[PDB]
Amino acid sequence: TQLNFGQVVADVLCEFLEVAVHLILYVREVYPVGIFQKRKKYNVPVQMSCHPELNQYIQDTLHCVKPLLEKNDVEKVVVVILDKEHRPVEKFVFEITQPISSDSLLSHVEQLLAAFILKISVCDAVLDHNPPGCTFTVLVHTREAATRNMEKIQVIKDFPWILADEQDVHMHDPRLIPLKTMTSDILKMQLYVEERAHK
Amino acid sequence: RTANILKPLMSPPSREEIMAT
Amino acid sequence: GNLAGAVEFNDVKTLLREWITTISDPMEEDILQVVKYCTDLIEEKDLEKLDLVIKYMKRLMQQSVESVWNMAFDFILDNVQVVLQQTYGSTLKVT
Numbered sequence A: 001t002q003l004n005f006g007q008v009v010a011d012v013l014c015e016f017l018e019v020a021v022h023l024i025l026y027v028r029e030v031y032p033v034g035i036f037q038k039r040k041k042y043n044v045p046v047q048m049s050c051h052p053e054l055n056q057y058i059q060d061t062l063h064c065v066k067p068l069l070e071k072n073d074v075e076k077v078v079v080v081i082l083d084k085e086h087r088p089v090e091k092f093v094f095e096i097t098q099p100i101s102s103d104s105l106l107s108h109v110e111q112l113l114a115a116f117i118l119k120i121s122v123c124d125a126v127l128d129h130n131p132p133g134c135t136f137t138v139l140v141h142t143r144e145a146a147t148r149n150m151e152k153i154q155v156i157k158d159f160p161w162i163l164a165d166e167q168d169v170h171m172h173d174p175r176l177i178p179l180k181t182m183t184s185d186i187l188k189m190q191l192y193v194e195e196r197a198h199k
Numbered sequence B: 001r002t003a004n005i006l007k008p009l010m011s012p013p014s015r016e017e018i019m020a021t
Numbered sequence C: 001g002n003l004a005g006a007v008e009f010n011d012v013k014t015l016l017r018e019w020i021t022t023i024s025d026p027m028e029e030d031i032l033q034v035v036k037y038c039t040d041l042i043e044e045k046d047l048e049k050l051d052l053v054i055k056y057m058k059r060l061m062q063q064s065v066e067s068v069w070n071m072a073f074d075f076i077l078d079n080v081q082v083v084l085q086q087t088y089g090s091t092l093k094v095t
């Protein structure tokens, strides 16, 4: 609604991401259904792990990312599903784009973010079944390479960050499945999935 | 030459670690 | 275990000698490429090569008048340590 700098933009996105990451883990069966509880976000059913270590890893991840969004340093936030052999299978990719105050305009972008969630809910329909034994990682693409980025993310202790290898990024013959694009003045975000040729 | 991609050093807990109460 | 093309260790000192002593504002991409080289020495279980590259870099970068290189080395070392602190439970002793 009201008050604070470019860091409701940041807590909006972070909250959105917490829900997004949780729901991706549910719809792509990365963890058993057992650990999940139905819940309500953006006036839309979502799903949310209450295994507290998983919840912490995701929380710690996004807390580290907050600072980079506050100053709009992030090109994309990628949820990578790896197979049981550590090989990238598919990529949920949030592309985020840069462009006074806020008021009840915010409760307009809360609305636009519901469609993303719904897109994720029913996205088994546009994507091949995933192979079993998958895990997941988080990649952050920054706008340009900058030490200020690596010093802003290395906040949370016991949770350091590294520069990803090519074995962490590369996906061969990747097919593109766009889920949702969105233009407000504050936020311009695309969600698209990069999917391997075969699994 | 790809120094704009960051990643947690730590992995999320595995399917195993979870499938064990 | 590769720094911008260099695999062997006498090659990697060639580069860092060249890069630190010629240039006067190091490109940020370069400083991160070196952090990645370093963090790769840790995964690859080569602490001797890690102490050796850190010891070298400390000589040239701290003997600079240009606080640019003094702070480069402070950024590099800080990143190596958080990663050694979490995979070995210790920090490099730097004499």
Ligand SMILES: Nc1ccc(/N=N\c2cccc(F)c2F)c(N)n1
Pocket: C004, C019, C027, C030
């Ligand atoms: N634009 C750059 C990139 C890296 C640099 N450091 N040494 C290199 C020189 C050429 C190629 C290369 F890969 C190098 F690492 C540099 N002085 N400028």
